[PDB]
Amino acid sequence: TMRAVKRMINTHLEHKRFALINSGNTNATAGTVQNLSNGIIQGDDINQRSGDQVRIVSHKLHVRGTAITVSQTFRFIWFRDNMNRGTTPTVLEVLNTANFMSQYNPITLQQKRFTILKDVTLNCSLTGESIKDRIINLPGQLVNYNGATAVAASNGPGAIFMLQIGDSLVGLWDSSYEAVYTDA
Amino acid sequence: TMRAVKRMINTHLEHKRFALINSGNTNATAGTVQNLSNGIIQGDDINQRSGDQVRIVSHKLHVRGTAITVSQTFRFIWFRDNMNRGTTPTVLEVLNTANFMSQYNPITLQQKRFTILKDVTLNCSLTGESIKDRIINLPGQLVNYNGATAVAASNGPGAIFMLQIGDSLVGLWDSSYEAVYTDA
Amino acid sequence: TMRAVKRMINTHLEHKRFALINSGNTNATAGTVQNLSNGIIQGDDINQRSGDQVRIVSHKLHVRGTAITVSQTFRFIWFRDNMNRGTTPTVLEVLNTANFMSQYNPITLQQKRFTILKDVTLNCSLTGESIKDRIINLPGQLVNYNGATAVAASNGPGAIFMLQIGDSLVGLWDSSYEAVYTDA
Amino acid sequence: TMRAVKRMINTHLEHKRFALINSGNTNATAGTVQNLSNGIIQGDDINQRSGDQVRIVSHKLHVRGTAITVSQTFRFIWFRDNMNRGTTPTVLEVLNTANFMSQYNPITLQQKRFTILKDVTLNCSLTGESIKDRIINLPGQLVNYNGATAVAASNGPGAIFMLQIGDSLVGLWDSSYEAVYTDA
Amino acid sequence: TMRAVKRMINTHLEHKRFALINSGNTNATAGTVQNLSNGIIQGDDINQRSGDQVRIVSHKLHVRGTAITVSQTFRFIWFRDNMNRGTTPTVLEVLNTANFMSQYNPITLQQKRFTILKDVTLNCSLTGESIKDRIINLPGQLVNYNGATAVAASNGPGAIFMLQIGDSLVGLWDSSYEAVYTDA
Amino acid sequence: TMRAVKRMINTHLEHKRFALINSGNTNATAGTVQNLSNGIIQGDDINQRSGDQVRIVSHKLHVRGTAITVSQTFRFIWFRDNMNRGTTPTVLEVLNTANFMSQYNPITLQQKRFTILKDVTLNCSLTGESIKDRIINLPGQLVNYNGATAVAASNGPGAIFMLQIGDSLVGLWDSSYEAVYTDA
Amino acid sequence: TMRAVKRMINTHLEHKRFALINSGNTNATAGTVQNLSNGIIQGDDINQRSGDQVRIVSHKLHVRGTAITVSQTFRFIWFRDNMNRGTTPTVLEVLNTANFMSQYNPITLQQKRFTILKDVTLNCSLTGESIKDRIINLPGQLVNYNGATAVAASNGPGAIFMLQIGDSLVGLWDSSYEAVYTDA
Amino acid sequence: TMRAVKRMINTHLEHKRFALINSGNTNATAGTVQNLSNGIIQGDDINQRSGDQVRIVSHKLHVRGTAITVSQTFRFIWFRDNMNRGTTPTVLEVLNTANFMSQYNPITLQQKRFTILKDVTLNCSLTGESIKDRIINLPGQLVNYNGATAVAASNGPGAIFMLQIGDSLVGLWDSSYEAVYTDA
Amino acid sequence: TMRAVKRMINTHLEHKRFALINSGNTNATAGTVQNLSNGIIQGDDINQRSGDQVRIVSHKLHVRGTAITVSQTFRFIWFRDNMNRGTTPTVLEVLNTANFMSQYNPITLQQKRFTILKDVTLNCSLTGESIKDRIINLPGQLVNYNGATAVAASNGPGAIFMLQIGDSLVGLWDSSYEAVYTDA
Amino acid sequence: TMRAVKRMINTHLEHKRFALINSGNTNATAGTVQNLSNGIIQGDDINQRSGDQVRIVSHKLHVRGTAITVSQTFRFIWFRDNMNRGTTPTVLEVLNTANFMSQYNPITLQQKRFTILKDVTLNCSLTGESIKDRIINLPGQLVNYNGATAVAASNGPGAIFMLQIGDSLVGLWDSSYEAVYTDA
Ligand SMILES: [Mg+2]
Ligand SMILES: [Mg+2]
Ligand SMILES: [Mg+2]
Ligand SMILES: [Mg+2]
Ligand SMILES: [Mg+2]
Ligand SMILES: [Mg+2]
Ligand SMILES: [Mg+2]
Ligand SMILES: [Mg+2]
Ligand SMILES: [Mg+2]
Ligand SMILES: [Mg+2]
Ligand SMILES: [Mg+2]
Ligand SMILES: [Mg+2]
Ligand SMILES: [Mg+2]
Ligand SMILES: [Mg+2]
């Protein structure tokens, strides 16, 4: 019976879509954290939200690494921040050490501060597959906001981030992100 | 049980209303296509939409023709464009020939490009009922948009149009349109 | 169960459509018989047939009379010829006498030579409703042909005709015809 | 019981087949959209249609990319246009931006203007697998047409297209397409 | 079971048809009674009877009045004489007074001398609908005869008549009558 | 139970009988069509009809060919015309070509214009059985007429004909026909 | 239930008919193979096909031999080629030796290359029945084609042929062939 | 259940075929016995056997007699020798006397030495049917051999023979024989 | 129960095996068709057949391509000819065009002339996996023959072939084939 | 019911986490054994234990090899020491010989001295994938200790080790280890 409720309710709720592209970035040893869900700002457009809450029905992540000069490994971490208070998470909050071989931070994952959605490691070789890509599609959850604009202060619980970290600074990595959500 | 769902859900969704008036237009031999649902633009007002989708619960069409100089026939076609891509439909896409006696286009109706809601023909005579009117009330369906403003490029699948065509160019026809819709 | 067969089969058969217009004709005392289904000719187009048989799912007739000079009556007979052998039926085969008040021919209707679909009589007055129209929509049956082109010799059993007869020779009557058929 | 209907009906309907080959084309940054189902024209031959509707039982897509000069990525999008009105779709209607990393257009996919059948990305490296191919076989649906010939104006709802877009202009990509359909 | 008897028996009995036309008659104040079923005479033709009895399966009456000079009312009475003895009924036997506003004769209708099938009153105005018509189709009953020819002496119980009476002597009224009967 | 109805009804209906003889006719290459049921004319005699309809309970055909000079083949076609309009059918309407080896006309038999009752081919040899005969007895159906006399214009749907065609013009063929029918 | 499917489907499919005549041919010792189903060519006519497949509902074969000079035997073989690749079968593929007394080829019938429908042998004597004929009516099966025209290259699996072989070269044999098929 | 065994086993066993022709032989008064099954010799070909046993699934006999000079009777006896020891049976072992009117030998048929499959007598007259033929198809049984080659010494139990005997020495008779057998 | 039949019967039937090797062949642009099942000839050896039929229980295909000079693609088509008449199939009968990217021939596959068992495409790169191989194991069906020796004329329905076609003429491809069959 | 116990108990027990990283080590021919679980020392911190027992709910192993100078194979053995007495296991206790191709020691695995969790072999080529990695996640068991500090003497039954051994001494391998355990 609950299935009928989903059909009945979701047929009356617009499934807004937001598209994000981030191409041309270099590989990092210390690492970087990239905002994906923050592009959803306040407004009456299809790629915007009313209020500070949106339910993401599903979202897609696409990454692609390229090897330059030397063979290198690209690591991508797709996680969810359930305790954000208006800040872009650092790398040391997600990993025990700032190394691509590092494991997740024991303190933060015990608290369930972050939820890992998918961790991807790409090895791109000059003498082999110099280019390597992967696509991930997963369901989403509720996403809160602490503001209106697309600045870090607008992030809230349920924020969406991607962590990139590797063994070289010369390779180039590209990514894209799309989300399907309801704003009611 | 599904009836309770409708009551439960529709009691929590605002039923926005949009009113449209179009009076003083002359009768046409070649014909004209008039936008009705495009007046719904983006915004936070009661006669506006958020996003690019709205479900029309019901809508009403009112037409009225007047005979001037000579007796003439007013034909009104109330149809739905389910394949709009940002254009106001022409008359030859709806009729085999640009004549008030013409039948619907076989190619487009086979594809279900247009859905006919109600076709009305009014005969107004100088020696008789010089004035003649009719009111139509029907349920609505989902209406998409390809933009934000009230220009033709904003029209999308589910658009609402009215086709007017007659045997004279001197008569005057007036119309009105109201829609009750939910924007969630 | 037979309902499912109709859905299963008709979803795989193209519903070809043919549109016919005939406007500007004068009213007749002796009467005239007009071909409607003969425009369907052999070919691979949407308004054509392969072979010499087509099943008409439904068809529509639209007529409109206008009074000129004097008040006059327009009579329209929409019948089906189930015994055609390559000829356009005459008026005396359909009516006992060549008069708009005449009844159907007793000899031919006993044989079921013709099947009456709808008989329409319009009275158009100069001091009243100078113009009068009517629309008829009915299901169709099998239609055979005795040729390929759009000449009278191509007509066969199941042909579609309209008989027009009135009390004056000055009035003008217009008509249109559309058919939805399967050619398999 | 409905299974028997499929066997009973499909044993009496010819399964026409159409073969298409497109080889020697260069990789594109802005992208290109290729017609596949338009080669089916009107006629009485096995690779032709009668009317403007055909049901595609199944269809197959074959692609193959080759790396020249530099390593490059080939992206292939196999989609269905359900709202075509006589035009070859552009790339910006299918992607948010004209980039191989771009996501699908939020506005058009919300409307269900296009249906994605299969998206394929091939990475061809000079130091590795310089050549890479893939074969896709899927069931088909109804395909309408707006004309008779093999020009873009003949395309209609259900049209079949392939989008090719990459990160270089020197690589060469080849493709083939076959469809099995019934024309009744 | 009795339904099968009707099908079994009526499939073996010829359904003879008789057509009658009476056009160009003037409106009457005192009134006139017109013979309709008397045209059925003795013979071996399709519009004739053997003996003096026929069962009328169904019969149709068509009337049409026209206004001349002044606006006038046409009254038509379609009745059945169940006690005829070889005479054409008068108007005073059917109406209390020889006036178009008169009610049926109390003495004769108490006896069931006449059976009223349909009473029609047409108001034709020079400034409005100068012409007005009506068609009636009803089942029939047994019809006896007192002779062989088409004279009044041949009428018997079950005879069919029409009474015409109005408020002017200048208008023209026309009529037609057809009957479907079995002669076994 | 329906069997009792047949006994009950047929015991009260006279079974009229009509006898026809046609002897001394020569064999034909182009062929000839002979009227058999037309001898039933209007009247009160036992071999006549009242009206224009008769139900033939059963009918019998007898043919006999004789060889003269050279051996020859006699072909006899006993068919029923269900779409007659007052004409004696030609040979080209029944056969694709005017040859004794010809097959039935594809166009007319698709329409069911003619119903084949029995086709008989007799080969008569001078050195063998110079004479050869055959008798056929079949049930009948309803037979309509378009007139009263025994001319071709009196033929109607359900008419009865025999087609004779052979490979020589010197042989002599004889025939007879009897029908048992009810005229009620 | 499957019977209803046949009625439901076959009532919507035209039963095209093709008529073939072949008269005046001499008897053969070595034998000859005659094309019967190849006359069905591509087109939109009633005696034509769309595509390269047709289902033959039923087909009829008529043969007739005549004795000239000396008494001779006519042998007729009506077979089906289920493995045709664009060639008219030879006589040695159907018979072990080129003799009218020969049996079927063991190699080809083991493979089921040919399917025998009916084998007819006629003995025509000058001192007896100089002429002898036979008619065969059988159901049909699917018939494929490898082309469009009526040449041998157009023949495919399911082709229809007749083999004629006898003990003399002076006799004359005639034949005809008709087929009832659906082209959907 | 045993039916399934036949299908299961016979689908895995080759059905070898052997064709035999014997034409141009004269009619005999004393009679002659002809070998039919002996042509099956040892080898790996389709018309050969491995070992000395074969099961004949079915076999066919075709005979044809011709009258020369005087009218004569051809008698054909198709029998089976179940006790053969390497000899071609004589005529006196099959008939009480060497006469075409003779009955079967009482001594040998009591022992079931021979099994009669079909006895055919043809009367061919110069003034009538000078030629007469007959075809017989029957199931077969096990056939043993006493050798390898096609000589009489190779015959064994189950051998197949035909006895020909008549009242004249001038007529010519022809025959053919085919067998379908399994060699496992 | 039918499973026991398979065990019971197959335990008494020898499972003959045939081994085929074909190494050192160059890649082809136009393509080549290779005989695999023809090596089975007549005889009493384990790799031979008696008669002209064998049931292949299972068969195995092994292919291996090598890149020389330039990177190239090897395409292998493993199909079954069900309508062979003593010929090695050409490439144009299996493919619409003589290109490695070509699709299967629509005309021949509609007829089911060929049955595709497995299509394999190998891409061999000089900078990567210069060598690439694949092994296929499938069940078999009945295989007929039209001769005795290992020439093309000996091929029959059920023949086994492999089609090789590529984009270069310098690469070398090798293959092997083994079949397990019963000859009873 | 036991499932509820797990939920009830594990919700009250802290799931301590320990993170270990070991990067920059060279490949070994003789091999090396690395301590992973010994980093868990006594204390009140989250990455420490109270007592000498901890239950590991789950643990993760990550390895990554890199090829330098020459292509080489990295072998990783992830095992459990269930009989430790305060010593780091040697390589000869785990393998029959100190070779990367060696099998496990028969004597020690019979005793179940070591339990193999996962054995991974990575082949890294200079002309191909110079870098190769793998991630393993498995449940854990009880882990005892014989001390307090992170020296080898502190190891006890249930210890966790990784064995690395390869065919070269120039390659570099990196690893990480994380464990989730309860200390109650
Ligand atoms: Mg919201
Ligand atoms: Mg909305
Ligand atoms: Mg048709
Ligand atoms: Mg490489
Ligand atoms: Mg079609
Ligand atoms: Mg009567
Ligand atoms: Mg009379
Ligand atoms: Mg009658
Ligand atoms: Mg055509
Ligand atoms: Mg077809
Ligand atoms: Mg044997
Ligand atoms: Mg041998
Ligand atoms: Mg065999
Ligand atoms: Mg503890």
Three-state SS string across I78-137, please?
A: EEEECCCCCCCCCCCCCECCCCCCCCECHHHHHCCCEEEEEEEEEEECCCCCCEEEEEEE
Strand blocks (E) in A15-158: 15-26, 32-35, 41-42, 48-49, 53-66, 72-81, 114-124, 131-139, 142-144
What residues contact residue H97 under an 8 Å CB cut-off, 6+ apart?
Answer: none
Instruction: Specify the 3-state DSSP secondary structure of F180.
Output: strand
CA J16 from chain centre, in angstroms, equals 18
The answer to whether I55 touches H12, Cβ cutoff 8 Å, is yes
Neighbours of chain B (3+ CB pairs under 8 A): A, C, D
The answer to whether J156 touches J143, Cβ cutoff 8 Å, is yes
Contact G16 F109 (CB under 8 A): no
Task: List the single residue in E4, E16, E184 with the smallest CB-CB distance to F2.
Answer: E4
**Angle between helices H2-10 and I2-10 in degrees, nearest 10:** 40
Q: Can you tell me the distance from the alpha carbon of F93 to that of F75, in angstroms, rounded to the nearest whole number?
A: 16
Composition of chain H by helix, strand, coil, percent to 5: 10, 50, 40
Q: Can you tell me the distance from the alpha carbon of I73 to that of I78, in angstroms, rounded to the nearest whole number?
A: 16
Gap from CA of G105 to ligand 12 centroid (Å): 23
Pick from C86, C81, C93: which is nearest to C157 by CA? C81
Q: What is the DSSP letter of E126?
A: T
CB atoms within 10 A of CB H17: 23
CB atoms within 10 A of CB E79: 22
Pick from I42, I7, I82: which is nearest to I183 by CA? I42
Matching residue, tokens 């489907």: G9
Strands E172-182 and E41-42: unpaired
Task: List the single residue in E8, E46, E184 with the smallest CB-CB distance to F5.
Answer: E8
User: Does H154 carry a binding-site annotation?
Assistant: no
Q: Can you tell me the distance from the alpha carbon of E117 to that of D117, in angstroms, rounded to the nearest whole number?
A: 69
Strands I48-49 and G41-42: unpaired
Tokens of C87: 């000829």
What does each C-alpha distance from B75 to B90, B137, C174 come to in angstroms?
Answer: 16, 18, 15
Residue J73: its H or E element: strand J72-81
The answer to whether E159 touches E143, Cβ cutoff 8 Å, is yes
Q: Can you tell me the distance from the alpha carbon of E14 to that of E184, in angstroms, rounded to the nearest whole number?
A: 8
At F175, phi and psi to the nearest 5?
-155, 165
User: Does F133 carry a binding-site annotation?
Assistant: no
At E92, phi and psi to the nearest 5?
-70, -20
Q: How many Å is the Cα radius of gyration of chain B?
A: 17
Residue in B with minimal Cα distance to D142: B111
Residue in G with minimal Cα distance to D10: G184
At H12, phi and psi to the nearest 5?
-105, 0
Q: Give me the total of CB pairs closer than 8 Å, taking one residue from chain E and one from chain F.
A: 41
Tokens of F37: 């049921």
What residues contact residue B28 under an 8 Å CB cut-off, 6+ apart?
Answer: B164, B165, B166, B169
Residue in F with minimal Cα distance to C107: F146
CA H28 from chain centre, in angstroms, equals 17
The answer to whether B71 touches C132, Cβ cutoff 8 Å, is no
Contact E45 F1 (CB under 8 A): no
Task: List the single residue in H128, H133, H174 with the smallest CB-CB distance to G128.
Answer: H128
Tokens of C11: 């979803």
The answer to whether I23 touches I151, Cβ cutoff 8 Å, is no
Beta bridge mates, H105 = none
Tokens of B33: 């296509």
For F139, what's the count of Cα atoms within 13 Å in the CB-facing half-sphere? 3
Q: What are the chain A neighbours of D110 within 8 Å (beta carbons)?
A: 14-17, 46
Matching residue, tokens 């771009």: D102
Strands J172-182 and J15-26: antiparallel
Q: What is the DSSP letter of D10?
A: H
Tokens of G99: 């003799």
Instruction: Specify the 3-state DSSP secondary structure of F106.
Output: helix
What does each C-alpha distance from G24 to B108, G20, G33, G170, I3 come to in angstroms?
Answer: 55, 14, 15, 11, 59
Tokens of B36: 């009705």
Q: Can you tell me the distance from the alpha carbon of B181 to that of B15, in angstroms, rounded to the nearest whole number?
A: 5
The answer to whether A173 touches A61, Cβ cutoff 8 Å, is no
Pick from F63, F43, F59: which is nearest to F51 by CA? F43
User: Does E103 carry a binding-site annotation?
Assistant: no
The answer to whether B49 touches B41, Cβ cutoff 8 Å, is yes
Positive or negative, the CA dihedral E147, E150, E153, E157 is: positive
Gap from CA of J176 to ligand 4 centroid (Å): 28
Distance from CA of H92 to the nearest CA of G (A): 29
Tokens of D67: 């790396």
Task: List the single residue in C97, C106, C125 with the smallest CB-CB distance to E131.
Answer: C125
AA identity, residue F150: A
Task: List the single residue in C12, C44, C45 with the smallest CB-CB distance to D13.
Answer: C12
State the resolution, in angstroms: 2.8
CB atoms within 10 A of CB B136: 14
The answer to whether I17 touches I180, Cβ cutoff 8 Å, is yes
User: Does F168 carry a binding-site annotation?
Assistant: no
Contact I52 H14 (CB under 8 A): yes
G129-138 as b/e, with b when 16 or more CB fall inside 10 Å? Answer: bbbbbbeeee
Strand blocks (E) in chain F: 15-26, 32-35, 41-42, 48-49, 53-66, 72-81, 114-124, 131-139, 142-144, 159-166, 172-182
For A96, what's the count of Cα atoms within 13 Å in the CB-facing half-sphere? 18
Gap from CA of H46 to ligand 13 centroid (Å): 8
Q: Can you tell me the distance from the alpha carbon of I164 to that of I174, in angstroms, rounded to the nearest whole number?
A: 11
Contact D111 B83 (CB under 8 A): no
Q: What is the DSSP letter of I39?
A: G
AA identity, residue A130: S
User: Does E14 carry a binding-site annotation?
Assistant: yes
Tokens of G113: 């290359």
Tokens of D112: 């269900």
CB atoms within 10 A of CB G170: 13
For ligand 13, an ion, list residues with CB under 5 A: H 14; I 50-51, 53, 183
Q: Can you tell me the distance from the alpha carbon of C136 to that of C175, in angstroms, rounded to the nearest whole number?
A: 11
Classify residue D101 as exposed, middle or buried by CB count within 10 Å of its CB (0-12, 13-18, 19+). Answer: buried
Strands F48-49 and J41-42: unpaired
What residues contact residue H168 under an 8 Å CB cut-off, 6+ apart?
Answer: H27, H29, H69, H70, H72
Spell out the domain ranges in chain E: 1-184
Residue A7: its H or E element: helix A2-10
Fold for domain F1-184? Jelly Rolls (2.60.120)
Among all bound ligands, the one having the nearest atom to the CA of G16 is 3
Beta bridge mates, F123 = F73
CA D36 from chain centre, in angstroms, equals 5
Q: Can you tell me the distance from the alpha carbon of I108 to that of I115, in angstroms, rounded to the nearest whole number?
A: 10
Residue G136: its H or E element: strand G131-139
Residue G41: its H or E element: strand G41-42
CB atoms within 10 A of CB A113: 18
H60-97 as b/e, with b when 16 or more CB fall inside 10 Å? Answer: bbbbbbbbbeebbbbbbbbbbbbebeeebbebebbbee
Positive or negative, the CA dihedral H2, H7, H11, H16 is: positive
AA identity, residue I172: L
AA identity, residue C93: E
Positive or negative, the CA dihedral H120, H121, H123, H124 is: positive
Tokens of G133: 């004929």
